[model samples]
Target: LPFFPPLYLGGPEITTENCEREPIHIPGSIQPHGALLTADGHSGEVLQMSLNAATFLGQEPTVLRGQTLAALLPEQWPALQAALPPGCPDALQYRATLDWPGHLSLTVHRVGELLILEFEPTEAGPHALRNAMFALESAPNLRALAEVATQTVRELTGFDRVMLYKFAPDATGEVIAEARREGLHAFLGHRFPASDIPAQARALYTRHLLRLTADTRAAAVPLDPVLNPQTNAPTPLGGAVLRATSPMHMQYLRNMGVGSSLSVSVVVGGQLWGLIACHHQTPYVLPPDLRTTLEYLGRLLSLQVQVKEAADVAAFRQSLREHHARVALAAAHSLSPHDTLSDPALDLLGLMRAGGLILRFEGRWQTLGEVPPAPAVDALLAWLETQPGALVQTDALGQLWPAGADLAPSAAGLLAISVGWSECLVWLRPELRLEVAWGGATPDQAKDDLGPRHSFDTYLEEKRGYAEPWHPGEIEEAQDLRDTLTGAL
Candidate 1:
């Protein structure tokens, strides 16, 4: 029997050691579907043109070089020059009809000192823009916003799969929402490692919000000399729509059996929060008009995300403040701080949703609910003293505290706040091992594969030595209570 490789490999099999060194910013080539032209910003002279530019513009690269804008498109020269005002910014973008007597549209932008001009035959109207904006305007929350975006983008772009990929604090990506064709493996809820997209690639996404790969298998068209004659440096094609992708990325996508891909950045407060990633099993091309419309939608989603997140934070903080007020009143009326704090009426466990509460005040320890032995608590507190800051939280106590290994029944995780020297209030969580369903290959499947496995077959994994994570709301409650207690002291 003949052997075949899997589409997606295991995590260990995909080595990202050289991902940082990959020259994604300078691919020295471009895709052939669109024409890319680089010109001198000061003189408006054509310095470089893609090999396919001649086919679209009716002028060969050899004849176009060193020629002024008037020589190529005398009809549109006035309009182009008018749009470019004095003291023009380092970057610019505009859509206009080409000098050619047809319906060809031009997308022009400037990067650094060079001007990049792209020519396509598609143009979008106001009606399409209005409908897209309407869809985005109706979203009530972040989850609904992402769902609407994926569905709308999938319908607009005609790709087989569209996913709303959210980034975590660690830079890993999670598929939060998805729209895909029937009979395809769903990537929703799957987590991809940070190495899948390195730091340099993320920087480029911040600058250029939209990226498309028309055909993953097609050979990238290399620039004629790979360097500008005047500057003797690699021509920066960051502004070009058809700029070639890094080979490492190409290989990674190929391993997933993707034929074409497109990504739109989801920005929040001027930072990249996530991405709308689309993939197709068959070759696909996105026209300039639809591409531009998608770009507008991405910006609209970003603003909506910022609004929803702010609202959530405000609501959570408000609840914490109310809890602190009650706790503070109880502390003020009581003779001993520990007695009032540990009182069942205050319900600190319910406030923090913790399994137990521990108060270490004036070298004396008080415990409530399920907790570790006194010796274990003493050891953990000693370790925390050596570390910095007033707040400490971890779901895996065993990894940080060796004594905690035997305390899984009651003290698997902890959230602590230091009030003073050797004084702290701590919340404990008991370990609860659960069977998790992983979307892709299980840890057992990783041993034999040379790369990531393509299977989406779900597998059960027993997760232990960990407890339920402390949410942001719980942390805020702990911090507010600490502040209130300190004030009473």
Candidate 2:
């Protein structure tokens, strides 16, 4: 069958108009395998139950209504209440047992004025947490961490594929590491656009650490009455494990040949940093216990990722500070600051990773390494002066200044930092011809559409007129250089 059928059959067209509004969070009902119960928060009186709750609870929906939780689970209520901390309103409580045939695990979540409880009949046993911790801790860098995480998660979940999907600052994602079953295609190094996971979806991932779709083809079960009796609004099911995904997302997955999926949030410092996306060619439901174990492991992974990133950043900053000090000292001893600034021994190229260094000070122009002709350089400098900020950088100089397109071959990436009095230091990196691999593309894919692309076939894009962009540390170094030069003058 085609990925999308006719519009008359209720097939959703991937478009900007509906992607963000797809209400994936508030799926009214849940999977039939689990049971749900809602009660009054303060009174502890049961108000609602899933249609199938009687299978495990041994009470029909009508019979459970108006009953207090204390009367239902008298043995477990005291331990639950005493263990719950004060002022932590949104806390979740979990209990697991091996002998109970009716229920194996119970999860309690506080949502607004309602207390929602979920019960599972059976689940997987505890995973080897020690092994997971040891494997992750041993990984030295981000790349190694991603590789280890993919392998560990794939092995634990028995999925066909596991990818460490990392989101960039611009919301785009790249598959940094992947572990796939033999005979399956690899997605490692493939880039996905921001629209693949909308802003709202990204925001929700931060709130809910994990989302599992047992089967993409399964029909979504709707909650009875569609509203909470207490609030008379859509029941908030953010923390529910059996929550149905949006139809559009279901279709997107099906198109990718995925039958089941589990996405665990890789958060850093309370923000959604990435995802450990697991996929299977066949429908698979994770055991409640195993899911819980993976969630905890994900948190530990996030902390380690944060530490590694911080260490890398700190090391880079220290290197920049060393370069700044050397540049400052060089300017102090020389009458012509531009001579020391553009000197090969000073290593401006190493600091900025640029092909050339141009120092335009006191109306004199000096160049080092390969650069645009003087006339073109003069024109570019005039345009840079009018732009805002003391430090400005762009990898696509031609796109930023169309008139400079001719100079792109020699100076594509430009980092300009002003030293006051129309004196500026410009670092230039030549355009690089390269190819980028995208996960998929829609019709006329070059045009931006704020909707998920339906295909996962490899799409190679040939790009030019751009160079390696400046890093945060490089930008800071440029600013430091400007300050040092101005103070000396």
Candidate 3:
């Protein structure tokens, strides 16, 4: 059993493993659309500022570097201290419209011991925010909410396309809903690889509500000082709105034929649920006021999703209770658990979406629906017996045990609960035939330091030897049933 790694041609390899560690937050630069400055948290002395601060904010970085915020903006110093607040907050903080001398909107947040300030031009926007909130509040269910979300975002941002890019348990993403200009191709049902966003990006998304890459090709403006004076490292821009987009990410959008993009992170309960990804065909600038409104809209969307999901899960839980009662009635009437489940009239398979079931209950054996040969069944149970957990499940049973391949066509998945020796129940699911249509290159297509993929060409991969994953709700149902069966046995 030799384990050989993939052969590489040259240069530094850019595998997902290394991509996870990329210091994307500390990019040491800001997108050219805005200016940024980092100051000492205690003394307010400006430590680093973007080079473009002179052109955009009417203050050269050299003159501003050693000056304190109080010295630079003496008239607004008292109010500024009240706005900046004390400790570092996890998300960006905003202040009431400042009477500062510029036409730019200023935002502040602290990262590490440095207080960071970001400035982007303020512009009047077209619509009202309350209208979109009303539309979302009226959604009857998850489908309706997602549809409204995409449409509302598209209308607000004026992007050519807007999609609800939802993340699956495996970290893969799927476009669950979409709204776009008529000529654009549909991505409403396409899937994307987990590597598309990588781990660090998702982590950042959880902390911030919105990220607008005004232009894919915009040059990044580096800070006046390469390293933070206090930390002697790249300044942490985790909460800075003007932080430069990672070059790899910029290349990814360019390859997708996008000129500008605004990514609204749909985070709920501190988990990166997915994104409300909006793409434009040409460089587009969002009004700073509208950008603020969109970030506010992102919060509304997050809360609405939380409420919708809670109601959906509640309904599913009620359905599970009803299903459990029916199965319990069938078992209660029978002479034994094995006989009750194996009877043709009993639909234990339907309850769990299982292809077949095996019951070793009360010292009796029974098999129902699609099943493997007796010897193969014995081998599976034996292997399962050695596993530490009483309740075991896997979508890829064959991958877990080599011999399970003999029964993979009928038993590629397993959901089992063992009450005691010879008192167990096993459910099987056949190998699922998956035809995933990726919006970009196939997930495993050759990749390098260039980016995630070289193109967005649709590629179909006929994935195999895996079963449909067991949902969280279904797993909860299984656990409840196990407890009931435990009591009965």
Candidate 4:
């Protein structure tokens, strides 16, 4: 008979090897192994499996591989049974629980006639990490603010997956900075799914100078006028075109099985930069008091982010000044561009690092580090000497460099930094670019892992996993750069 997968749940034939002799061990628990199986339901074609045994269960990854994975589970659980082939058409979510009492989640991808499953332990609860992004308002630089911002948001909302979400010109975004609560997975360097929040969502989010969603599941009462200024008491639908919020949005969350979430707009110089997103695993309702507090904190952070971003400009200027000193020191002698180029830009990088450096410059190109490519270094200095003015910054480079191609990654987004009379100081890290800010009522109640206790000594020893940590001498180095730039100018 021709074979076709069943439209209903059914038991697959199994082998002794396919069934477990011992209780399965849950992942992230005391045990690591579990018994599993996959067999032809109708044919009774025996295909037995287990977590550790190299059978169909282990080899085929039954939970995620088939068009309808219901065949893998015990053909009888209410939840599993309700979902069969042509499964709950509204959404298809497959959960696998082992006899060992452990469960796993999967993100499935469909390829021609095949299903590819990637496993992500169900242990994760969303409390994204924090990072610094440049904004328009006055605020501290990312170098000075990222860690503190991460700590504050983690404590305030209690999420495991809080992140510094930055929007790009293309409407896509990235997490430039992140901080995870103790024991939670580190989303620090990880990027979020591109579709988690789409472009239209970001635009709507930024309309207010600051806004907060305490719980995503609960209905959001539309704010009249929808533009910050409160509308009169009897106002009509109030700029809310979607009459009753978006049911699709809630369904989308339900599709992912997410229970609660929150996002806060991070504004800079009055423009939207990005958002801070916090997530939770269970349904939630934000208390009125906390909701108000969240709004207050959002404003404070917006200011904080702005100050830091503006400082990005100052950071570049500071570097320019330092390089100027190097230039003056070089100009004092008959040092040619070649002679000046001979010195490892380490001194320059060292200066940038001290002055609240974001990223280090290696001549024209920008990297997370302090050095430039050999050719970029040559191009940077050559361009510096050609500028008519003694000082140059992003604007200067835009005119001097060909499409400013010399900056490499630096040219990718909005570039800002300080300039010098004979040299241009580029921001190693980007200045603020507007993206949506994230923060809401989501909480990560799982892990309680604490990093090393904070102390001057520990701060020195405990290396940052993402950006380079500040060294004792970094401040002095920045000062030296300024002195050089001042003298050269």
Q: Compared with the true structure, what per-residue lDDT tens digits does model 2 show for residues 148-233?
A: 88888887888999999999887888999999999998899988877678777888888788888889888765555567888776
Model 3, span 1-489: residue lDDT tens: 111121111224445446665667777788998878788878889888888888866666677878998987675556666766676474747543444455667787766577888777774334456877888988988889999888888877788999999898778899999999988878878888787887778887888778878899999888878688896766777788778887777888898888998888888888988798999999988877777777777788889999988887777778778778977777666676766777666577887889979888656667777888888888777777788766888888877888677787898888988884467889899989888888776656635444466656577888788889776677778878888777765
By TM-score, how accurate is candidate 1? Answer: 0.88
What's model 2's lDDT at 455? 64
Cα error, candidate 4, residue 284 (Å): 1.6
Distance from true location, Cα of 32 in model 1, Å: 0.9
Model 4 segments more than 4 A misplaced: 1-162, 168-172, 175-186, 193-195, 209-248, 310-323, 332-489
Predicted candidate 1 versus true structure: per-residue lDDT over 1-489, tens digit per residue = 111121111112224433454455566788877777777766788888777777888876888878987777777666666776545653467777654644677877766666778776764345756776776677766678788888888888788999999887777777889999999988887766666667767777877888888888988877666677667777777667778976667766787888999898987776789998999998888777778778888888788778877766777778777677788888878787687788898888878778988888867989999888888878877877887888888887888777668988798888988874488888888898976655555545543454445555566678898989887777766777768777777
Model 3 collision count: 0
With a 3 Å backbone cut-off (N, CA, C), the pairs that clash in candidate 3 are none
TM-score of each: 0.88, 0.89, 0.89, 0.38
Q: Higher-lDDT candidate among 1 and 4?
A: 1
Show how many residue pairs clash in every candidate, following the order shown. Answer: 9, 1, 0, 69
The true-versus-predicted C-alpha distance at residue 77 of model 2, in Å, is: 2.9
Say what the RMSD of model 1 is.
Answer: 5.7
Worst 10-residue lDDT window for candidate 4 reads 22-31
Q: Considering TM-score, where higher is better, how would the candidates rank from best to worst?
A: 3, 2, 1, 4
